[PDB]
């Protein structure tokens, strides 16, 4: 339960497969709904049970309520702490674009990683998590663009 970034693994497919990534903060594990589909997780000999989740937001928390509440300021570069399958964690700095929706505008990160990188955290210059990478679109020119997906701290 040390704070930090974690891989989410399964043995249900061939060998051991990385299906996504998440963030341990304040004793809560944070990831994208489509990574776990709300299943329980193991950490060593211990179990993490889902506590909150929402398919439309594509988010889920384990062991307690969603704790991440920092926001992209709309101006500054950010860092993706990318954790790709079988590869070391690496920081990638970028200026977000924008997703424009009927319900308002969201920052967007235009970086292409494999599906199992979903749930990698996006950071501000204070190292705060401003959202998770891995729900987005493929655009005309073929690139992957991710929303900056952030939950609500209740």
Instruction: Tell me whether residue 109 or residue 130 sits nearer to ligand A1JHL (CB atom).
Output: 109
| 47 Cβ neighbours under 8 A, 6+ residues apart | 40, 41
Contact status: 39 vs ligand A1JHL (CB under 6 A)? no
Contact status: 132 vs its own copies (CB under 8 A)? no
- Could you say which of ligand A1JHL, its own copies, none residue 134 binds, taking C-beta under 5 to 8 angstroms by partner kind? ligand A1JHL
Active site residue 43: no
Q: Which of 113, 147, 148, 150 touches its own copies (CB under 8 A)?
A: 147
The interface region with ligand A1JHL, picked from 21-29, 61-69, 94-102, 131-139 by CB under 6 A, is 131-139
């Amino acid at each position: 339960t040390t704070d930090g970034v974690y891989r989410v693994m399964t043995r249900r497919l061939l060998g051991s497969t990385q299906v996504g990534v998440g963030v341990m903060q304040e004793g809560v594990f944070h990831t994208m709904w489509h990574v776990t589909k709300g299943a329980a997780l193991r950490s060593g000999e211990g179990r993490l049970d889902p506590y909150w989740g929402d398919v439309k937001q594509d988010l889920v928390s384990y062991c307690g309520p969603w704790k991440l509440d920092a926001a992209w300021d709309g101006l500054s570069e950010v860092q993706l702490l990318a954790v790709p399958p079988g590869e070391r964690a690496k920081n990638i700095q970028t200026l977000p674009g924008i997703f424009k929706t009927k319900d308002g505008d969201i920052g967007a990160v235009a970086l292409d990683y494999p599906a199992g990188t979903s749930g990698s955290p996006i950071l501000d210059k204070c190292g705060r998590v401003i959202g998770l990478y891995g729900n987005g679109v493929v655009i005309k020119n073929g690139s992957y663009v991710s929303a900056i997906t952030q939950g609500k701290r209740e």
